[PDB]
């Protein structure tokens, strides 16, 4: 019964393994034949293995006391020169922006011959589910939010006359029909329509484009394939006949003030451009109108420990000349990505140290302490793993965010410590995101080993 079937399966498997072993044996037999042929292709210089000399330099000689009955052999110890060692470290992943480490199925594609019509949750389901308006990325790793979406789920003039070819509105008695149909969604089209086959892909594309464009017909005909505008009106008629500082989390609620009922208010944070609330929202941060350099406590962004959003602060300089060096506003250099070059050398205190090649003045950006975002609990586990070998790189960014740059960081992770540091750390919220910026405490001259007070961080 079952035992017999198991025995038969075992016999078949044994035959299979024997057969594969034999076949690989034949292949490896040919390969080892050519290998031994290559081995016998060329000889080698006769290694006499002469017993060196008899104390050529008059140094210590070897004592090879053979355990078996043989005389002890003596050979001078030919000492070899030594080489400079190197402090220990592990491999690391280069990086320049933060990385949040994680802690009937669908419709067919219009591409290809196989296409149809499907508008259950409209025809736009794949490109609307995975999205991130902040970084413009599909299923991004920077903003690993809840992502409630899952499983890939206006006035204009009338186009009178037949624009190019025959237009829909130029047809005798159809514009008023379109107007009446639009009004009801809260002479006229009496002529019989044409009969042209419409494919599923064309139907879906026309439906989506009309839903997003509405009354316009010449343009939709231009962007569609064939699709005579009169036929467009015909389908339009027929379809109706058929039927403690946190990052700025955006809020979407049109015609709704943000006051005691908004997550931005609950977090004591201003609504940013990504927020979809009313343009006259109470919590909206007014763009500071600095003349330049945004480095005085005068600017509300500077006074409240914040950077400058290019959408709000226009004349401050945080938006103009995006593709350039650090902007005039000195409160937006973290977002721009411009920093100072750091070098690596054996530290004069212990281990390795980051040695800046250029001098940095008082309160100046040096580099961003990037890494991988992990929650406080994941920060605890990662820090324990790193401290297993007694070298931690954990740093605090926000209340519930911690940057750890052991497995993935930059050259700024090799920061030494003293009671009198030459540098200090200050976190600034850039474009609704928190990014640590390293600042020099005093006028640092060229090429010295840097410092940073560990007492500021969680790991002191």
């Amino acid at each position: 019964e079952y035992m017999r079937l198991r025995q038969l399966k075992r016999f078949r498997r044994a035959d299979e393994v024997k057969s594969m072993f034999s076949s690989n044996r034949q292949k490896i037999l040919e390969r080892t034949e050519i290998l031994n042929q290559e081995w016998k292709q060329r000889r080698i210089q006769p290694v006499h293995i002469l017993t060196s000399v008899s104390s050529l330099r008059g140094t210590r000689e070897c004592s090879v006391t053979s355990d078996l009955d043989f005389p002890t052999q003596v050979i001078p110890l030919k000492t070899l020169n030594a080489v400079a060692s190197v402090p220990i470290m592990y491999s690391w992943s280069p990086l320049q922006q933060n990385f949040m480490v994680e802690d009937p199925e669908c419709t067919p594609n219009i591409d290809g011959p196989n296409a149809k019509s499907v508008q259950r949750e409209q025809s736009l389901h794949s490109f609307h589910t995975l999205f991130c308006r902040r970084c413009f990325k599909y299923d991004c790793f920077l903003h690993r939010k809840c992502n409630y979406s899952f499983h890939a789920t206006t006035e204009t003039a009338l186009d009178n006359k037949p624009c190019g070819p025959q237009c829909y509105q130029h047809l005798e008695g159809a514009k008023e029909f379109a107007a009446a149909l639009t009004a009801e969604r809260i002479k006229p089209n009496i002529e019989p329509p044409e009969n042209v086959e419409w494919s599923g892909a064309e139907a879906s594309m026309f439906r989506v484009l009309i839903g997003t464009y509405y009354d316009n017909f010449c343009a939709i005909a231009r962007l569609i394939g064939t699709k005579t505008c009169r036929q467009v009106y015909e389908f339009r008629v027929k379809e109706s006949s058929i039927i403690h500082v946190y990052n700025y989390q955006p809020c979407d609620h049109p015609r709704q003030p943000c006051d005691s009922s908004c997550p931005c208010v609950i977090a004591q944070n201003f609504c940013e451009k990504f927020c979809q609330c009313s343009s006259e929202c109470q919590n909206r941060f007014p763009g500071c109108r600095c003349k330049a350099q945004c480095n005085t406590k005068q600017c509300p962004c500077y006074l409240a420990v914040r950077e400058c959003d290019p959408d709000l602060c226009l004349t401050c300089g945080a938006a103009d000349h995006w593709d350039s060096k650090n902007v005039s506003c000195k409160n937006c250099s973290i977002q721009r990505g411009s920093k100072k070059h750091l070098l690596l050398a054996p530290s004069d205190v212990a281990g390795w140290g980051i040695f800046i090649k250029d001098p940095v003045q008082k309160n100046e950006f040096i580099s961003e302490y990037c890494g991988e975002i992990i929650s406080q609990d994941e920060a605890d586990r990662r820090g324990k793993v790193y401290d297993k070998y007694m070298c931690s790189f954990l740093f605090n960014l926000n209340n519930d965010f911690v940057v750890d740059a052991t497995r993935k960081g930059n050259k700024i992770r090799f920061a030494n410590h003293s009671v009198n540091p030459n540098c200090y750390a200050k976190v600034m919220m850039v474009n609704g995101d928190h990014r640590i910026g390293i600042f020099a405490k005093r006028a640092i001259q060229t090429g010295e080993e840097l410092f940073f007070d560990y007492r500021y961080s969680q790991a002191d």
Binding site: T59, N81, A82, S347, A350
Partner: peptide
Amino acid sequence: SLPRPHDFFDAQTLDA
């Protein structure tokens, strides 16, 4: 503290 970097002398010439 950082130990002595390396004894450049006497690495090999001590016996000589």
